[PDB]
Amino acid sequence: PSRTALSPGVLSPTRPVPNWIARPEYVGKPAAQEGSEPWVQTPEVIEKMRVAGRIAAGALAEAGKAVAPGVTTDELDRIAHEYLVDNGAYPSTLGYKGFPKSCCTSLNEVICHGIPDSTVITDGDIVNIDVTAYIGGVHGDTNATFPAGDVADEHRLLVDRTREATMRAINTVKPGRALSVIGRVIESYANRFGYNVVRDFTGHGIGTTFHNGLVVLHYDQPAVETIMQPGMTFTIEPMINLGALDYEIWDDGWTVVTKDRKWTAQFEHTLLVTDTGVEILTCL
Numbered sequence: 001p002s003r004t005a006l007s008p009g010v011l012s013p014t015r016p017v018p019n020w021i022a023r024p025e026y027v028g029k030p031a032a033q034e035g036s037e038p039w040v041q042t043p044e045v046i047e048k049m050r051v052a053g054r055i056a057a058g059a060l061a062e063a064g065k066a067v068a069p070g071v072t073t074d075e076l077d078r079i080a081h082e083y084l085v086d087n088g089a090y091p092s093t094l095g096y097k098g099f100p101k102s103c104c105t106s107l108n109e110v111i112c113h114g115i116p117d118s119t120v121i122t123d124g125d126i127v128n129i130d131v132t133a134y135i136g137g138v139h140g141d142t143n144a145t146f147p148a149g150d151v152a153d154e155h156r157l158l159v160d161r162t163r164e165a166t167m168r169a170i171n172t173v174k175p176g177r178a179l180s181v182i183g184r185v186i187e188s189y190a191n192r193f194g195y196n197v198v199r200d201f202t203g204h205g206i207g208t209t210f211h212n213g214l215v216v217l218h219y220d221q222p223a224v225e226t227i228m229q230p231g232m233t234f235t236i237e238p239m240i241n242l243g244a245l246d247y248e249i250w251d252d253g254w255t256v257v258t259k260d261r262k263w264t265a266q267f268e269h270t271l272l273v274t275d276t277g278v279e280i281l282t283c284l
């Protein structure tokens with residue numbers, strides 16, 4: 001048997017960032033300056049995003065390595081935070097529209113945007129950790145769902161098939177392809193198992209800004225005319241649900257949970273469209 005429905009715990013004090021680390025503009029402001037930037041990056045921007053992406057990948061791997069029964073989500077945040085700052089990177093979530101931590105930790109029925117807190121991870125949980133680094137004036141964004149101890153077959157297959165859906169979408173990235181093929185591949189794969197792909201949350205262009213206005217749908221909608229072009233950088237980050245798509249937000253205003261409390265899994269990479277195919281920027 002698995003755990004029952006989560007409730008919110010208490011947050012640790014705000015984690016400090018040394019002053020020599022440049023803040024993204026939106027830290028300390030109610031909203032962010034983003035959503036109207038070019039989608040294709042310059043070679044110099046792409047080189048800085050390789051750095052940001054590899055640091056984020058490091059933070060995710062170190063926090064992921066710690067996922068185990070007994071560990072709290074706040075403990076995962078401390079590991080991510082420290083990895084980012086010791087690498088000279090600002091954690092993009094920290095202060096983003098007031099978000100109070102340095103990564104999102106979303107267990108079980110939490111679709112996304114779980115706030116690291118006193119919540120204790122337990123056997124059979126699935127723990128998504130989503131972390132973004134801001135360094136060299138650019139962002140790199142990545143996430144993965146990690147099993148804690150032995151997970152029930154249905155939840156283990158949900159995680160594995162979500163990771164496979166994500167890799168299948170990434171391997172469709174190639175200049176000239178409609179961006180829509182990503183959602184077509186993800187949803188067709190998910191529907192084999194009777195899963196539902198979340199529609200209200202999407203992937204996004206990313207560059208000097210965290211969400212540059214480019215939207216990447218994870219469901220099938222071929223009316224979108226956008227084509228993948230060399231130099232474009234965006235995320236693929238499908239959330240796939242065992243149950244229905246209906247959701248609710250906690251009183252904290254951030255934590256997004258499935259209304260029927262059935263579990264959900266997500267993976268995410270920041271990608272570059274190259275002249276021949278794709279490069280994953282959030283790689284170790």
Ligand SMILES: Fc1ccc(CSc2nnc[nH]2)cc1
Nearest residue numbers: 093096097099104113130141
């Ligand atoms: F409003 C928020 C709060 C936290 C995040 C970081 S999780 C995430 N990574 N790609 C999309 N979302 C993003 C937006």
Ligand SMILES: [Cl-]
Nearest residue numbers: 112201202211
């Ligand atoms: Cl989002």
Ligand code: NI
Nearest residue numbers: 112113201202
């Ligand atoms: Ni998000």
Ligand code: NI
Nearest residue numbers: 130141142143
């Ligand atoms: Ni993310």
Ligand code: NI
Nearest residue numbers: 141235237268
């Ligand atoms: Ni993202």
